[PDB]
Amino acid sequence: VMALKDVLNEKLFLLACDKGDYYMVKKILEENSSNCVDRNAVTITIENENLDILQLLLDALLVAIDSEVVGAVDILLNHAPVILAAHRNNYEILTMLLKQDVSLPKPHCTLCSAKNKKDSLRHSRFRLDIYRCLASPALIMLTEEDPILRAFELSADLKELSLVEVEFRNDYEELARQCKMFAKDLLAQARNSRELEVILNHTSLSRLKLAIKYNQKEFVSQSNCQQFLNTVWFGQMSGYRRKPTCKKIMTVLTVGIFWPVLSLCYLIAPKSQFGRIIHTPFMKFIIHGASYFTFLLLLNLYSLVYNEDKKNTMGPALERIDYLLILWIIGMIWSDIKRLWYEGLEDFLEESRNQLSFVMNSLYLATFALKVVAHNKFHDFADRKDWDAFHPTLVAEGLFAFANVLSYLRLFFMYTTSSILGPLQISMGQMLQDFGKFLGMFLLVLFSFTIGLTQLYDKGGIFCEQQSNDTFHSFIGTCFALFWYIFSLAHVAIFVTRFSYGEELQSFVGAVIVGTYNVVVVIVLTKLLVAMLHKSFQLIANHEDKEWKFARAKLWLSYFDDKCTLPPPFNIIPQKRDENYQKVMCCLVHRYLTSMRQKMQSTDQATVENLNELRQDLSKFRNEI
Amino acid sequence: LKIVAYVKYNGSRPREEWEMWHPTLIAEALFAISNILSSLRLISLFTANSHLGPLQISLGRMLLD
Amino acid sequence: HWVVKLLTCMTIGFLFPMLSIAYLISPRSNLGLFIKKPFIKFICHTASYLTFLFMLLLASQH
Amino acid sequence: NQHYQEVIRNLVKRYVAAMIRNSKTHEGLTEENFKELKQDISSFRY
Amino acid sequence: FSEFTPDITPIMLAAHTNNYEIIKLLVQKRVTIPRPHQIRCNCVECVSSSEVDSLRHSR
Amino acid sequence: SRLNIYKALASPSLIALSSEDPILTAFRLGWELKELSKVENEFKAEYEELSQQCKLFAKDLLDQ
Numbered sequence: 001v002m003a004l005k006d007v008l009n010e011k012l013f014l015l016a017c018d019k020g021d022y023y024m025v026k027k028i029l030e031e032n033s034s035n036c037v038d039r040n041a042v043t044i045t046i047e048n049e050n051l052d053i054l055q056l057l058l059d060a061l062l063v064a065i066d067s068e069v070v071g072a073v074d075i076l077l078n079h080a081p082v083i084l085a086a087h088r089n090n091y092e093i094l095t096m097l098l099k100q101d102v103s104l105p106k107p108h109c110t111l112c113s114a115k116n117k118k119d120s121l122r123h124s125r126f127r128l129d130i131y132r133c134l135a136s137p138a139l140i141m142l143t144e145e146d147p148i149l150r151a152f153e154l155s156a157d158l159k160e161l162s163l164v165e166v167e168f169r170n171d172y173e174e175l176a177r178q179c180k181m182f183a184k185d186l187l188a189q190a191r192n193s194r195e196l197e198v199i200l201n202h203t204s205l206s207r208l209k210l211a212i213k214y215n216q217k218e219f220v221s222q223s224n225c226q227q228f229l230n231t232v233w234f235g236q237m238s239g240y241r242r243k244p245t246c247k248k249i250m251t252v253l254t255v256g257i258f259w260p261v262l263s264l265c266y267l268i269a270p271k272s273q274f275g276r277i278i279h280t281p282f283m284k285f286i287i288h289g290a291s292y293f294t295f296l297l298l299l300n301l302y303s304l305v306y307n308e309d310k311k312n313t314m315g316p317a318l319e320r321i322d323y324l325l326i327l328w329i330i331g332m333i334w335s336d337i338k339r340l341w342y343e344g345l346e347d348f349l350e351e352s353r354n355q356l357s358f359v360m361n362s363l364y365l366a367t368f369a370l371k372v373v374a375h376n377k378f379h380d381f382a383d384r385k386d387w388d389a390f391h392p393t394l395v396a397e398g399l400f401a402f403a404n405v406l407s408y409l410r411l412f413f414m415y416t417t418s419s420i421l422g423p424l425q426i427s428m429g430q431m432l433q434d435f436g437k438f439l440g441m442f443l444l445v446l447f448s449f450t451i452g453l454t455q456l457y458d459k460g461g462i463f464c465e466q467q468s469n470d471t472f473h474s475f476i477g478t479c480f481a482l483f484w485y486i487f488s489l490a491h492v493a494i495f496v497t498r499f500s501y502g503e504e505l506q507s508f509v510g511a512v513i514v515g516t517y518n519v520v521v522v523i524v525l526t527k528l529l530v531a532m533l534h535k536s537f538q539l540i541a542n543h544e545d546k547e548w549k550f551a552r553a554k555l556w557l558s559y560f561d562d563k564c565t566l567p568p569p570f571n572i573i574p575q576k577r578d579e580n581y582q583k584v585m586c587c588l589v590h591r592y593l594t595s596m597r598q599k600m601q602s603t604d605q606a607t608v609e610n611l612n613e614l615r616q617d618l619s620k621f622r623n624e625i
Numbered sequence: 626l627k628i629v630a631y632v633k634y635n636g637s638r639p640r641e642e643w644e645m646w647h648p649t650l651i652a653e654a655l656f657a658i659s660n661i662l663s664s665l666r667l668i669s670l671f672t673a674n675s676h677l678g679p680l681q682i683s684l685g686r687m688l689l690d
Numbered sequence: 691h692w693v694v695k696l697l698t699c700m701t702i703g704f705l706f707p708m709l710s711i712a713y714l715i716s717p718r719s720n721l722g723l724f725i726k727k728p729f730i731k732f733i734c735h736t737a738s739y740l741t742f743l744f745m746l747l748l749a750s751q752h
Numbered sequence: 753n754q755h756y757q758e759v760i761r762n763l764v765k766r767y768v769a770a771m772i773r774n775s776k777t778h779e780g781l782t783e784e785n786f787k788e789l790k791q792d793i794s795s796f797r798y
Numbered sequence: 799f800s801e802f803t804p805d806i807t808p809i810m811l812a813a814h815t816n817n818y819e820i821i822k823l824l825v826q827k828r829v830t831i832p833r834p835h836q837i838r839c840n841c842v843e844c845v846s847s848s849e850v851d852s853l854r855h856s857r
Numbered sequence: 858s859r860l861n862i863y864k865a866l867a868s869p870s871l872i873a874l875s876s877e878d879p880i881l882t883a884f885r886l887g888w889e890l891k892e893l894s895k896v897e898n899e900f901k902a903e904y905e906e907l908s909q910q911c912k913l914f915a916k917d918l919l920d921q
């Protein structure tokens with residue numbers, strides 16, 4: 001058994017101040033005329049909103065703000081605190097407290113390093129306390145001139161701090177999310193298109209481009225922002241949306257088919273009726289799309305018009321079709337430097353479509369550089385079967401075929417425009433990150449079994465009709481054989497594991513090693529991969545609409561600039577507004593305050609409760625007098 | 626097994642004539658299996674990585690079923 | 691950036707034998723104290739195991 | 753041991769304070785205490 | 799600062815609130831609600847309103 | 858009766874009030890309650906809940 005153990009006027013004064021006692025506290029003050037802890041004997045009265053009793057005692061501050069009692073704070077102020085007030089995120093006390101001049105030190109030196117040596121837990125906590133005060137929606141509205149821009153910059157600031165402060169990761173990304181949701185709610189108060197155009201065109205579509213740079217996905221997906229995008233995207237052809245589905249397709253096909261004419265008309269008469277057609281973004285996207293579709297058609301026709309007598313030619317000359325492809329490739333390349341030069345390396349390299357253009361453009365230059373050199377060096381007439389394995393003509397055709405795969409794979413970005421295949425394509429893009437983690441673990445398993453298998457057989461391939469044991473006689477051959485076992489489609493037979501001359505025991509051991517590899521990879525690693533794709537997809541499915549809309553708006557904005565207007569073959573050929581912004585800002589800010597109050601003040605319990613409090617004050621006064 | 630095989634035999638013989646339970650063959654098979662097992666020990670170092678380590682722990686937790 | 695971390699890790703791993711002999715000869719020396727850091731010690735152990743595996747690769751090539 | 757006890761004395765003090773306020777997400781009983789104040793005023797009366 | 803959009807009428811707000819008693823009170827006065835055009839209407843007024851101010855038209 | 862006694866012993870207030878060091882007591886009590894669920898098969902849920910309560914109390918005490 002274990003025995004549990006805990007390891008007069010002041011009491012009359014404390015009990016009196018607890019429960020609505022004013023006159024006989026005045027009596028206790030009279031008795032004392034002739035700091036107790038259960039506390040200054042005043043904090044209890046502060047939390048009870050007994051201002052009359054409080055005023056009598058006055059004739060703590062941080063506790064009053066923690067209780068959000070405006071009356072107590074006002075009396076205490078009449079008879080850092082700002083940082084704690086901003087934590088509570090409310091307007092009345094924040095306005096009153098800031099009326100007196102108040103400063104707040106900015107966060108990061110050599111001096112700060114000295115403090116971190118003495119106490120690092122305290123140093124980290126203070127920095128997070130300041131940033132939580134700065135990210136208060138009430139404080140930004142009352143202190144900042146451009147609340148929308150302030151929320152954009154702070155949100156990007158707080159996201160970076162989460163990466164460095166790994167242990168404070170959760171707290172910081174909660175503050176960044178709060179900043180993003182504030183700027184989106186400010187935009188939702190716009191009422192007409194005049195206010196919408198003022199907000200989204202201000203410069204410190206600069207605001208619209210700034211949101212894309214700062215990854216404001218919630219801001220972009222708002223209905224006001226989406227409606228504004230549609231008008232600019234379609235431009236003067238707003239009647240396109242009124243046309244039926246059968247009439248829409250005939251308009252797109254007609255514009256695409258006559259793309260060479262429209263691109264030529266803008267070249268000679270830019271100001272004509274047909275010249276200005278390209279200027280609207282939607283038709284520019286179609287013209288650029290139809291230009292690329294003809295480039296892929298030329299590649300398909302390259303083999304069809306290939307003369308059979310050139311298959312045995314070692315130094316074939318460039319055909320007319322070859323000159324056409326050279327013109328397109330220079331056109332595609334020329335547009336690439338322009339985009340990179342106007343934006344920068346990091347912005348340009350970030351998009352996957354741009355990366356696929358880098359590799360395929362170098363491969364197209366290599367095959368044509370090799371083709372010209374081969375025609376000038378090796379022109380002999382000999383059959384194909386007698387050439388060297390690494391002849392320049394054979395190397396040129398290997399690079400050309402590889403670049404054709406990357407040309408057709410660039411069409412993935414065109415699925416983003418569609419509202420049916422758009423969300424699905426974005427969902428598949430985000431699940432590719434989970435595949436990379438499985439590659440690291442599987443790559444070590446494949447390397448482990450390759451070591452043992454080549455040790456057992458080399459002392460004593462799969463691409464022949466009769467597969468033999470010779471696939472295990474090299475490191476490269478062993479890796480290829482194990483690679484084709486992953487599918488479970490019986491690409492490689494078991495007879496391969498058997499030694500050619502005998503080695504009865506060593507043949508059985510090699511078969512057991514391969515059988516263990518199959519169970520580990522095909523039955524264990526594959527099922528584990530499916531388990532996470534089931535888990536990750538459910539989380540992704542939640543934000544499917546918000547992610548797709550951000551990707552579509554990013555793609556549309558690239559066609560708003562007039563820097564690149566001509567298609568690739570044709571491209572190679574040679575205080576007044578700040579005052580208006582402030583007027584809209586004050587309207588949006590004041591609407592937000594009014595709207596937000598109804599969001600949380602709906603039950604009205606503190607109205608009837610306040611009436612009951614007045615009733616109790618009157619009742620206590622009655623008997624007391 | 627290598628020492629036993631070295632002590633027992635002094636002459637040379639073609640491989641195709643040896644019995645299946647010759648000590649040398651068992652030694653080579655055990656060496657190959659030991660190589661395979663030794664290469665797999667690197668999985669225990671995945672715990673130090675923020676990306677690979679959670680996947681390694683989750684895989685270990687699901688092996689009971 | 692992670693490339694600098696990778697370069698530092700590879701540089702420390704390549705020098706593990708010298709650090710081991712330095713610790714063996716004189717722990718009082720600064721080089722001997724250098725290996726006592728847990729992170730450098732982990733890097734040295736990983737480098738030694740990787741060297742063992744690489745030399746296992748050589749035997750398989752015969 | 754003396755230093756460990758001092759830190760434990762303060763950690764327990766903040767813990768009992770913390771979860772009471774975290775339990776105030778459900779504390780709307782202030783009005784019922786207000787009635788206790790009316791009862792105390794009646795007791796002072798008689 | 800006006801809390802409601804200028805196109806809001808008392809009957810429209812009452813219908814938005816879905817209060818049976820207030821709607822019964824107002825409808826006794828014989829109020830009316832403007833009728834909407836077709837989803838694909840292409841007339842002078844619709845086009846003029848959409849080009850002049852599309853957000854207000856949609857709202 | 859055993860279940861009632863062990864629920865009484867695993868209250869954070871009692872440990873905070875009548876233990877020399879609540880952290881070590883919480884550790885030992887949580888481990889002991891965890892071992893008990895494997896013996897009392899019928900009442901395993903309650904014992905796991907009590908052990909989780911002890912662990913949460915220890916973590917929350919550390920959090921201050």
Ligand SMILES: CCCCCCCC/C=C/CCCCCCCC(=O)OC[C@H](CO)OC(=O)CCCCCCCCCCCCCCC
Pocket residue numbers: 445508511512513514515516519520523524
């Ligand atoms: C990254 C790490 C992931 C987890 C790794 C461990 C996973 C758990 C399993 C380990 C695999 C153990 C080895 C199993 C295969 C042995 C080789 C083998 O049989 O080769 C044939 C060899 C050669 O013909 O034959 C034998 O070994 C003779 C005995 C065969 C008896 C039949 C099979 C026994 C049951 C095996 C079940 C495997 C799972 C099937 C699920 C549908």
Ligand SMILES: CC(C)CCC[C@@H](C)[C@H]1CC[C@H]2[C@@H]3CC=C4C[C@@H](OC(=O)CCC(=O)O)CC[C@]4(C)[C@H]3CC[C@]12C
Pocket residue numbers: 443444447667670671673674675695736
């Ligand atoms: C398939 C063939 C090429 C062999 C593959 C070997 C890998 C399975 C092993 C070998 C060395 C290992 C690495 C050795 C040391 C580290 C550093 C370790 O982090 C640290 O200690 C430093 C801090 C950091 O960089 O995060 C994280 C795991 C990692 C990358 C290991 C990850 C798994 C690696 C790459």
Ligand SMILES: [Zn+2]
Pocket residue numbers: 835836839840841842843844
């Ligand atoms: Zn109409």
